[PDB]
Subunit: 139 residues, 2 copies
């Protein structure tokens, strides 16, 4: 009902304020949350496939191939055809992108503190329980 | 720290499971959350501008103009140049899109119940308080 609808709305609003505030925080590095996400994904995993990257993206945009090409010319990522399967593209961080991650992690750390630090320790425990209960229900 | 980072992660994960589950729910109507969003925005407001629509989108995709053209050929929305300002495009729902909203609202109502109804009434009140506290902090 209106209680369920009000809850869906509150969770989206908080999520959207968090992306807005993260984008503000990483602004200086000429990247947005979407490019930042790719850099985080590609640092953890090694040289993965385009498909693996799309799968590992928590949220996939409506222009991945275009968006990666932009990152390719910018010098953050490098793409190459897999010598085994010619219809597959492997993607990985360049030295510059590796260095860009290091520099952005400092602003990201500050982002999490300044934006996810408003609750008391008691409230954090309550919020954690409730959000994990919600995950189990949805998957 | 790790508490702040774990909280950011939990809120994103729940949000992403909600879009996944909504897309599954509205699948039959040949639309995704992004097209559904536009239909909801355009039903509430009347004939708005492309800019107004982009602003009123809680989350704006990386291909609005392309994505609206797709909805234009599909017959959900209609676009026209404003006779006052020629460099401005006005957008609005067609009869089909108006009818599509009616039919999707039934599945959306079921989506909210099946996905945002897992908490007790006591928990709903606690979750509401915590999420509103988070909004005030972020804006």
């Amino acid at each position: 009902g209106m209680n369920n609808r009000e809850l869906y709305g509150n969770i989206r609003d908080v999520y959207h304020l968090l992306q807005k505030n993260l984008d503000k925080a990483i602004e200086q590095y000429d990247i947005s949350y979407v490019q930042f996400g790719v850099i985080q994904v590609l640092a953890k995993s090694g040289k993965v496939s385009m498909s693996k990257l799309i799968e590992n993206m928590g949220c996939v945009p409506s222009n991945m191939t275009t968006m990666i090409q932009r990152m390719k010319r910018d010098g953050y990522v490098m793409t190459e055809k897999n010598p085994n399967d010619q219809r597959e593209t492997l993607v990985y961080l360049t030295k510059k992108g590796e260095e860009t991650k290091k520099q952005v992690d400092v602003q990201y750390s500050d982002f999490l503190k300044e934006n996810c630090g408003c609750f008391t320790k008691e409230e954090e425990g309550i919020l954690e329980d409730l959000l994990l209960k919600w995950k189990k229900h949805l998957n």
